[PDB]
Structure 1
Amino acid sequence: DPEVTLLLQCPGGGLPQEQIQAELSPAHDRRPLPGGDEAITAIWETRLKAQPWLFDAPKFRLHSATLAPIGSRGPQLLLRLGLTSYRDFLGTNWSSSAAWLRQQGATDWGDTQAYLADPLGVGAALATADDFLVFLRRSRQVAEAPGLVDVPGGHPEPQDLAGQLVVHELFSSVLQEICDEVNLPLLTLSQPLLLGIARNETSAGRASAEFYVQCSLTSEQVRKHYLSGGPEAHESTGIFFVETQNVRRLPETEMWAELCPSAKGAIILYNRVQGSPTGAALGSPALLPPL
């Protein structure tokens, strides 16, 4: 699918928190725009003068992610991170001129992303005790991917020797987003495993970390918890479930056309890293039917 590119596929069925290092450095920040950051300031002033209740927030910026040689001991992943903001996102990735900033970045820095905010998103493939994944319908009133299907997630907000605290906030934030939006108790959720990193080509290449989380509740109990919050307890307008059996072929369904690019990323990485068995037993024709 051309609206999603894989930056990273994790080994071993996905990486726990203890196997990831982060390097948070101003060397990983966005570069100042060619004619100056005054362009970002002008877009922000126009937006506030229309919507004065808006506020800025800091974000992590993804620079790059390097996997160790497979089968090695020690830390398996290095995440290179900078800092950005909602304001910088609205003035770059979301700008009408975002494709021009990518061309300029290639020319000036040999890096299509050099002049982009590129805030790091998080998302979950969330599995129930009865083997379904959880999907959410987006409001038709929001600016981004209105009315489309999504998975749980949300752009983490800042605050290996501050590195480990940054990895902790990324893993924490995926569980926190599931509690806030799906209304599940924290104690029903497994520690997340990182499946990979996917890039949204419809948002100038901004990246999301995609995780696997297991819930001890059935689909029926997850639905009850979500609905029991009422319309004000959640940003989404509805919840639904697809058997993990059927997720394998999702790209061939009519649902695929309704999935926002970052949820497409979560499903592709789930299928490659948690699905696609490698051993004789799970690989046998009766358990892995052809076609």
Structure 2
Amino acid sequence: DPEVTLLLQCPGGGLPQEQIQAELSPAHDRRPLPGGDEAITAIWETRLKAQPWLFDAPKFRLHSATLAPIGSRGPQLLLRLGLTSYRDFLGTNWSSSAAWLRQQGATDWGDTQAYLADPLGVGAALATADDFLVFLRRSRQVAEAPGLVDVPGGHPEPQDLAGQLVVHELFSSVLQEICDEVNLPLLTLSQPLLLGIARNETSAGRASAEFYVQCSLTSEQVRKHYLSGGPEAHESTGIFFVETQNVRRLPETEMWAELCPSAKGAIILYNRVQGSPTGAALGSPALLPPL
């Protein structure tokens, strides 16, 4: 799977909010482009002159994520974050020249991402009370990954002593995205666990934080809530469910070729962090069938 790389796999079956620190600093921002940020401004002007209803929005930028030594007490992860925007994304990661910016960043800064916006996405492995994961079909008319399968998620918009509020907004944003798109009540959702961070190599390396969320509704009840919103209540064109039993071998199915890179990231991390048992009971051959 060349279109996704794992930046972080979390320990302990995934990390809760209270175990993560963020450092939000202008040191973690994108570097100005070699010939100046005028190239980003030109792409934005051209776009607005065709689609004048478009608007910019701020985004978090991922610089790096450092895990503590395994088994340690105290905070387990440090997220180094900057600020970027939808405009900077369209002028860098989504530019035809994005590969040239990656090479120039390696040359100038020893960092393939130094000249990239790299907005931080969020996604969820969302499990039902009857042990299915939730999948969404993307519209065939959108710009990125048209017609592909996705999981719930989005790209959160800003607003350890500014740090803890930023970690809170990240965890909050994955639940909000599930309520807005799947039409589920907030009180049916568990607090999220962070499983890891995955990179989309088809979008010049931009990263998504991938979370595990449990719902107290069955697959049938989740479907009812999604459909009862009507076509204008969701951006996706359909919902469907796969047994957690069958997610284990999803990369061997015909579904795998239809999954967008960030959803492949969510399923790989779910399989490594929530699946793949370590103990004698769940590891026994009748509960973990070989092959």
Q: TM-score, normalised by structure 2?
A: 1.00
Q: In 2, Cα distance between the equivalents of 1:94 and 1:26? A: 22
Cα distance in 2 for partners of 1:156, 1:28 equals 17
The within-5 A match list for 1:261-272 is 261-272=261-272
Q: Corresponding residue for 2:109? A: 109
2: CA distance between counterparts of 1:279 and 1:193? 21
**Superposition deviation, residue 120 in structure 1:** 0.1
The corresponding residue for 1:89 is 89
What is the rounded CA distance, in whole Å, between the counterparts of 1:205 and 1:161 in structure 2?
29
Cα distance, 1:84 vs. partner?
0.0
Between the aligned partners of 2:155 and 2:79, the Cα distance in structure 1 is 16
Q: Give the 3-state SS of the residue equivalent to 2:209 in structure 1.
A: strand
- Give, in angstroms, the shift of residue 227 of structure 1: 0.1
Shift of 1:212: 0.0
Residues of 2 paired with 1:30 and 1:208: CA distance?
17
Matches of 2:177 and 2:210, distance apart in 1? 13
Question: What is the alpha-carbon distance in structure 2 between the residues aligned to residue 195 and residue 122 of structure 1?
Answer: 11
For residues 2 and 42 of structure 2, the distance between their equivalents in structure 1, rounded to whole angstroms, comes to 32
The CA deviation at 1:123 is 0.1
Report the 3-state secondary structure (helix = DSSP H, G, I; strand = E; otherwise coil) of the residue aligned with 2:122.
strand
| 1:183 CA displacement | 0.1
Q: Counterpart in 1 of 2:215?
A: 215
Deviations 1:129-172 (A, max 9, x none): 00000000000000000000000001010000000000000000
Structure 2: tracts of 5 or more residues without a match: none
Deviation at 1:217, TM superposition (A): 0.1
Q: How far does the alpha carbon of each residue in 1:206-232 deviate from its partner, in whole angstroms, 9 at most, with x for none? A: 000000000000000000000000000
- Deviation of 1:261 (Å): 0.2
**CA apart distance, 1:97:** 0.1
Tell me the secondary structure at the aligned position of residue 170 of structure 1: helix
What is the Cα deviation at residue 78 of structure 1? Answer: 0.1
Give the superposition deviation at 1:9: 0.0
CA-based RMSD of the aligned residues comes to 0.1
Q: Distance in 1 between matches of 2:265 and 2:172?
A: 20
1: CA distance between counterparts of 2:79 and 2:27? Answer: 13
Within 2, Cα distance between the matches of 1:232 and 1:125?
24
* Distance in 2 (alpha carbons) for counterparts of 1:42 and 1:18: 42
Instruction: Give a deviation string over 1:243-269, Cα, whole Å, max 9, x none.
Output: 000000000000000000000000000
Q: Which residue of 2 aligns with 1:77?
A: 77
Distance 1:141 1:257 in 2: 19
Shift, 1:242, TM fit: 0.1
Structure 1 SS opposite 2:210: strand
Q: CA deviation at 1:284?
A: 0.1
Alpha-carbon separation, structure 2, partners of 1:134 and 1:38: 42
CA distance in 2, matches of 1:153, 1:38: 31
For residues 284 and 2 of structure 1, the distance between their equivalents in structure 2, rounded to whole angstroms, comes to 33
Count matched residues.
291
- Alpha-carbon distance in 1 for matches of 2:230, 2:141: 18
Runs of 4+ in 1 over 2 A off after TM superposition: none
| Inter-partner Cα distance in structure 2 for 1:244 and 1:37 | 46
So what's the TM-score if we normalise by structure 1?
1.00
